[PDB]
């Protein structure tokens, strides 16, 4: 579960902000939030590697708490 997939985001959101968003729940050890080079903008889906299982199990619940720019965010195991 150490990693989660996160959908439905707005490009003003940032990886550093994202790390602080999910570390509100529990620390994101490895952050991945693609920067698309071609048009220089984000599609808004994320992958998160944690310390161990602990971060992963919480992950799905952490999704409900999240609400970026008046919108929700998908979090599921991976």
Partner 1 sequence: NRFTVAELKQLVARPDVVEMHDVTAQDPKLLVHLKATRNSVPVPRHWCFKRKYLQGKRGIEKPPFELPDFIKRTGIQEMREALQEKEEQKTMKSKMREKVRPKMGKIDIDYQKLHDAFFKWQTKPKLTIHGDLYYEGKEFETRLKKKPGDLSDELISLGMPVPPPWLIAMQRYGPPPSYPNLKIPGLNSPIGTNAAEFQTKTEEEEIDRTPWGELE
Q: Which region among 32-40, 41-49, 51-59 touches partner 1 (by CB under 8 A)?
A: 51-59
Quick one: which of 2, 4, 9, 28 contacts partner 1 (CB under 8 A)? 28
From 12, 34, 54, select the one nearest 23 (Cα to Cα).
54
Query: Are 7 and 76 a contacting pair, CB within 8 Å?
Result: no
Quick one: which of 9, 33, 48, 55 contacts partner 1 (CB under 8 A)? 55
Query: Are 72 and 63 a contacting pair, CB within 8 Å?
Result: yes
Which residues sit at the interface with partner 1, rule CB under 8 A? Answer: 16-17, 19-21, 23-29, 50-51, 53-55, 57-58, 61-62, 64-69
């Amino acid at each position: 579960d150490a990693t989660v997939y996160v959908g439905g985001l707005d490009e003003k959101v940032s990886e550093p902000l994202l790390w602080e968003l999910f570390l509100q729940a529990g620390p994101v050890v490895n952050t991945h939030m693609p920067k698309d080079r071609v048009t220089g903008q984000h599609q808004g889906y994320g992958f998160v590697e944690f310390l161990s299982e602990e971060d992963a199990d919480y992950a799905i619940k952490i999704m409900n708490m999240i609400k970026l720019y008046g919108k929700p965010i998908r979090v599921n195991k991976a």
